[PDB]
Amino acid sequence: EAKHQQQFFQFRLSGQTIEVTSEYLFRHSDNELLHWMVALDGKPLASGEVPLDVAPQGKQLIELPELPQPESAGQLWLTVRVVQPNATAWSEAGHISAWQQWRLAENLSVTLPAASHAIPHLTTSEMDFCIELGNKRWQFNRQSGFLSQMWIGDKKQLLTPLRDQFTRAPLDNDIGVSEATRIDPNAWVERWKAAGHYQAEAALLQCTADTLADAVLITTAHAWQHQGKTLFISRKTYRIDGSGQMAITVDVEVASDTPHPARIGLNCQLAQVAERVNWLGLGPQENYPDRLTAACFDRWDLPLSDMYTPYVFPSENGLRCGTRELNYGPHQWRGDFQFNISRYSQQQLMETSHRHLLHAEEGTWLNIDGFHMGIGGDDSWSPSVSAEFQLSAGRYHYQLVWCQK
Amino acid sequence: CTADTLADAVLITTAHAWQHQGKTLFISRKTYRIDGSGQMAITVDVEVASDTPHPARIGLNCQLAQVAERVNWLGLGPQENYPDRLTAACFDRWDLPLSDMYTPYVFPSENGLRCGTRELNYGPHQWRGDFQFNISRYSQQQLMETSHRHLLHAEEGTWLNIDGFHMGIGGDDSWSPSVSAEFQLSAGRYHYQLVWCQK
């Protein structure tokens, strides 16, 4: 982020041309070339290299060629980079000094899914709701109202039920100068624990199931309470399609008087560990709602070890925003969400105070959040998060599609 | 366009798409739920293309067949307020005549919008949820076509426009786009829920 925000080259896309403005004051652009690439949902279509000849604090105009626009559904992204060909005394050959990305024309998906010939079968137990579709199987716990288990063949895929998560591991900016012996009432973590965010117990309100013509609909509605005061109300709709897709639509209502939650989304612990994570979204670095300018939208395939940022003081880390697709092992999640996946739970990151004392848990912890709250950074003793990055709307909605690839 | 009965409700799933010259601009997916108590639950999800210009409105539109003399809404009022001009309005219960719902601008344009509305009672109809509503005797197409307020004529029934999201009005100048980026409909995906019942 520091590298992207301190670039000596500013880019402005107008129509099809690109205005490049140098911020150098004394040197001429003699060791830089511009490399542009157009990608449809992570799949490249066209590319080219244009040398840069920019005067100090000057202007240059680059006229792009005919950009291919296919009729396939997706979003076209244009990414430009500045590459230094020769080796400077402080940089190697091929060093990138600046980059920028823009959203080109979008082709919305208007096609219809094929008719599901096979229909899901629903068994209504006294304490469970079990949906079977060939190899696929799901089991909802009627006592808790959450997705208790998923089955492919005879292998369990969930160690813990897929629940909601309105809390995160407190960051260094959230704690502030608050200790055990000194309590700062303005610190975000103290307001969260004072309102019972970390101690809220989910109470089941509604849990119904009914079969449709070609699908099975599960309607769940919970409420989080603390000392008789309701903080959050979550209403979820689960749809099992005959093609195998799980459509989860979640609506969250947050009280106005309670402190703004740091996270609105889901949480689970998968029973299978994988060595690769392939996500289409903003990356490949750790990015947040107030720190996503450096990240670029593309398809990134990275090992699970790089999903966890090795902060010595444990906190929330590894979040990737603007994620359009996420492939992990046999699981695929689609929609617009912010995901973080690691081997350590959020409660372990909260309890532990050193990274060397952290231990990898069974399975893999995954946190998919429809909405995430900022990190701040103006100072480490006062709330530094701007009002535009705080979860203060009151009503939130997000849709997830869970399938097996 | 599908319909199916539930254990205690009837679900209607509709999904449309707006196109122009072979290019899709907006995609609307609606879910209608008829409950046994009489409530209509309409959940609408709208997808807007990024390259197209930002729409000025995302919501519903209808023309009721009954005219009423009072409008009773719980929300921000009692004046005409907009997403960038709602600081003066206060949240309360306002009961006002239908004649005051239309601001008599001599040059016809969009008017009468009330933001932050939590409930809206008009005749036998009651709408609940979070929405921005404007109700008048003149359609939006008539306001577009007509250039004077004295040439406007009241149509049959009453035109109602309930919008989940509304875009700003500007006002810095009358010759350049004055609407700030925070008041523009540029998120891409929008969702709103309405409850229509008879009181």
Task: Report whether B46 contacts B28 (CB < 8 A).
Answer: yes
Task: Report whether A68 contacts A104 (CB < 8 A).
Answer: no
Residue pointed to by tokens 């670039």: A7
Q: Which residues from B are below 8 Å from A399, CB to CB?
A: 45
Are A106 and B7 a contacting pair at CB < 8 A? no
Task: Report whether A138 contacts A157 (CB < 8 A).
Answer: no
In whole angstroms, give the CA distance from residue A268 to residue B36: 36
For residue A316, what are the contacts with CB-CB under 8 A and spacing of at least 6?
A168, A169, A170, A171, A262, A340, A346, A349
Are B27 and A103 a contacting pair at CB < 8 A? no
Residue pointed to by tokens 């020769």: A86
At CB < 8 Å, which residues of chain B contact A?
2, 4, 6-7, 11, 17, 19, 24, 27, 45, 47, 49-51, 130, 182, 189, 191, 193
Are B50 and A395 a contacting pair at CB < 8 A? no
For residue B183, what are the contacts with CB-CB under 8 A and spacing of at least 6?
B83, B84, B167, B168
SS (H, E, C) A269-314: EECCCCCEEEEEEEECCCCCCCCCCCCEEEEEEEEHHHHCCCCCCC
Question: Whose CA is closest to B139, among B156, B118, B116, B119?
Answer: B156
Are A104 and B51 a contacting pair at CB < 8 A? yes
Task: Report whether A396 contacts A232 (CB < 8 A).
Answer: no
Task: Report whether A303 contacts A192 (CB < 8 A).
Answer: no
Strands across the sheet with A95-107, in order? A43-51, A33-40, A74-84, A95-107
In whole angstroms, give the CA distance from residue A49 to residue A32: 11
The burial class, CB within 10 Å (0-12 / 13-18 / 19+), for A134 is exposed
Q: Which residues from B are below 8 Å from A106, CB to CB?
A: 49-51
3-state secondary structure of A350: helix
Residue pointed to by tokens 């009503």: A395
Are A397 and B24 a contacting pair at CB < 8 A? no
Resolution as reported, in Å: 3.2
In whole angstroms, give the CA distance from residue A263 to residue A390: 10
DSSP B115-138: EEEEEEEETTEEEEEEEEEEEESS
Q: Compute the 3-state secondary structure of chain B and give helix, strand, coil in percent, each to the nearest 5.
A: 5, 50, 45
What is the C-alpha R_g of chain A? 24
| Closest alpha carbon within chain B to A216 | B6
> Cα torsion at A5, A371, A354, A179 (round to 10°)?
100
- Sequence letter at residue A80: V
Q: A369 has which bridge partners?
A: A265, A338
In whole angstroms, give the CA distance from residue A30 to residue A11: 18
Are A75 and B17 a contacting pair at CB < 8 A? no
Q: Which residues from B are below 8 Å from A251, CB to CB?
A: 193
The burial class, CB within 10 Å (0-12 / 13-18 / 19+), for A150 is buried
3-state secondary structure of A192: helix
Residue pointed to by tokens 């880390």: A317
- Sequence letter at residue A31: N
At CB < 8 Å, which residues of chain A contact B?
75, 103-108, 110, 208, 210, 212-213, 217, 251, 336, 388, 395, 397, 399
Task: Report whether B115 contacts B183 (CB < 8 A).
Answer: no
| Strand extents, DSSP E, A85-127 | 95-107, 121-124
| Closest alpha carbon within chain B to A214 | B4
Degrees (nearest 5) of the Cα angle B159, B164, B165? 105
Tokens of A185: 């009432």
Are B2 and A210 a contacting pair at CB < 8 A? no
Mutate to test the interface with B, among A67, A71, A108 (most CBs of B within 10 A): A108
For residue A279, what are the contacts with CB-CB under 8 A and spacing of at least 6?
A299, A300, A320, A323, A325, A326, A327, A339
CA distances from B26 to A369, B53, B181 (A): 26, 11, 20
In whole angstroms, give the CA distance from residue A141 to residue B113: 45
- Sequence letter at residue A95: H
The burial class, CB within 10 Å (0-12 / 13-18 / 19+), for A7 is middle
**CB count in 10 Å sphere of residue A51:** 11
For residue A385, what are the contacts with CB-CB under 8 A and spacing of at least 6?
A173, A188, A290, A373, A374, A375, A376
- Sequence letter at residue B105: Y
For residue A343, what are the contacts with CB-CB under 8 A and spacing of at least 6?
A273, A304, A308, A360, A361, A364, A365
Tokens of A212: 């449709």
Q: How far is A75 from chain B (nearest CA, A)?
A: 9
Residues after which a C–N gap over 2.5 Å breaks chain B: none
**Ramachandran assignment for B149, one of left (phi > 0), alpha (psi -120 to 50 degrees), beta (any other):** alpha
| Closest alpha carbon within chain A to B3 | A213
| Closest alpha carbon within chain B to A398 | B191
Residue pointed to by tokens 């969250």: A252
Within chain B, where are the H helices?
A: 140-145
Mutate to test the interface with A, among B50, B130, B165, B194 (most CBs of A within 10 A): B50
SS (H, E, C) A12-26: EEECCEEEEEECCCC
Containing H/E element for A225?
Answer: strand A215-226
Q: How far is A344 from chain B (nearest CA, A)?
A: 32
Tokens of A116: 């599901």
CB pairs under 8 A between A and B: 33
Q: Select the residue of A210, A336, A399 nearest B7 (Cβ to Cβ).
A: A210
Containing H/E element for A2?
Answer: helix A2-5
- Sequence letter at residue A235: R
The DSSP secondary-structure symbol of B21 reads T
The DSSP secondary-structure symbol of B181 reads G
In whole angstroms, give the CA distance from residue A396 to residue A290: 19
- Phi, psi of A327, rounded to the nearest 5 degrees: -110, 125
**CB count in 10 Å sphere of residue A244:** 16
Q: How far is A219 from chain B (nearest CA, A)?
A: 12
| Strand extents, DSSP E, A343-385 | 364-372
In whole angstroms, give the CA distance from residue B33 to residue B10: 6
3-state secondary structure of A240: strand
Are A395 and B27 a contacting pair at CB < 8 A? no
Q: How far is A353 from chain B (nearest CA, A)?
A: 38
In whole angstroms, give the CA distance from residue A132 to residue A105: 41
In whole angstroms, give the CA distance from residue A252 to residue A265: 9
Q: Compute the 3-state secondary structure of chain A and give helix, strand, coil in percent, each to the nearest 5.
A: 5, 50, 45
Q: A83 has which bridge partners?
A: A33, A96
**CB count in 10 Å sphere of residue B81:** 20
CA distances from A182 to A187, A190, B36 (A): 11, 11, 56
| Closest alpha carbon within chain B to A112 | B15
Q: Select the residue of A75, A110, A397 nearest B50 (Cβ to Cβ).
A: A75
Tokens of A330: 């046999």
Containing H/E element for A37?
Answer: strand A33-40
Question: Whose CA is closest to A396, among B186, B190, B40, B114?
Answer: B190
For residue A56, what are the contacts with CB-CB under 8 A and spacing of at least 6?
A22, A24, A25, A26, A27, A28
In whole angstroms, give the CA distance from residue A285 to residue A238: 32
For residue A238, what are the contacts with CB-CB under 8 A and spacing of at least 6?
A140, A147, A217, A218, A219, A220, A246, A247, A248
3-state secondary structure of A193: helix
In whole angstroms, give the CA distance from residue A222 to residue B169: 39
A99 has binding-site annotation = no
Degrees (nearest 5) of the Cα angle A265, A269, A273? 130
Task: Report whether A118 contacts A134 (CB < 8 A).
Answer: yes
Experimental method: cryo-EM
3-state secondary structure of A172: helix
In whole angstroms, give the CA distance from residue A226 to residue A221: 17
The DSSP secondary-structure symbol of B37 reads T
> Cα torsion at B134, B135, B136, B140 (round to 10°)?
50
